[PDB]
């Protein structure tokens, strides 16, 4: 793949390092989208206390 | 919003269903975040096989 023919041109110790970081990169991934929810939810809210 | 304007619409039992739905759904894309990560580690892997 194209994200094979780029990572084989970078270090051992590059590699090493994006490996460890996904992780983590994901964790925040998710708060993210925890925050979103709050806002996809809000309205229905809004719309239960018009009624 | 459009969106709102839809909302007010519906009965309480349709807003209760759609807020519990949203759950379910905030799972399923954290589920979806995991299938994106591992994607990325596997290039990663292959790209350090290949020293």
Avoid: C, W
């Avoid at 991934?29 to 925890?34: C, N, Q, S, T």
Wanted: hydrophobic share 40%; net charge negative.
């Amino acid at each position: 793949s194209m994200d094979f023919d780029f990572l084989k041109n970078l270090s051992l110790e590059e590699l090493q390092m994006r490996l460890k970081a996904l992780d983590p990169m994901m964790e925040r991934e998710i708060e993210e989208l925890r925050q979103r929810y709050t806002a996809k939810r809000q309205p229905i809210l809004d719309a239960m206390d018009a009624k």
